[PDB]
Amino acid sequence: ASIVSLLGIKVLNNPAKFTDPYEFEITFECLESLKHDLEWKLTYVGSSRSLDHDQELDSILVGPVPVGVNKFVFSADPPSAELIPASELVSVTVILLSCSYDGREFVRVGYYVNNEYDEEELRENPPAKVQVDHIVRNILAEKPRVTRFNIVWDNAAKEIKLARRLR
């Protein structure tokens, strides 16, 4: 309608280790009282090749939703490196942060995440076995990709396809 609108997002604690939590300070406006909570979720894209390697990192229910301008910190566990193809682990991928209301997604914010080793020795000559504790993750927070979707609230009345995951 839209009863809730994203106003701003700050990626906290960035860069970070691959194994550190994700932290976002999210600012949203709510215009009317709602029956239901907001569900915020974060999805890590394991492979640019299929939805088959996505991992839902966490989700958090926010509510009852107060009318006005709201701020909260969303934190989420890192993905399991075990379940990401070894060859795609230390590369660019995307994260998608979305908010749904009663199951209906009304906003998505996508970010590219660059993954690179912390030591010069490993960057040019990476091993076959991946050193997860040595991955530094950088979310490209200056480049958010925001897609809003129109929903009913309470009343009825690689880089090619990474870019595609973002939209």
Author numbering: 1 to 157, 165 to 174
List sentences from the manuscript:
We determined the structure of the conserved N-terminus of budding yeast Asf1 bound to the C-terminal α3 helix of yeast histone H3 to 2.2 Å resolution. The only significant changes in the structure are a forward rotation of the loop connecting β-strands c and c', as well as a small rotation of the loop and α-helix connecting β-strands e and f. The structure solved here shows that the histone helix binds to Asf1 in this predicted region, but in an unanticipated orientation. A lone salt bridge is formed between the invariant residues Asp54 on Asf1 and Arg129 on H3.
The histone H3/H4 chaperone Asf1 (anti-silencing function 1) is required for the establishment and maintenance of proper chromatin structure, as well as for genome stability in eukaryotes. Asf1 alone adopts a switched-type immunoglobulin-like (Ig-like) fold containing two extra, short β-strands (termed h and h').
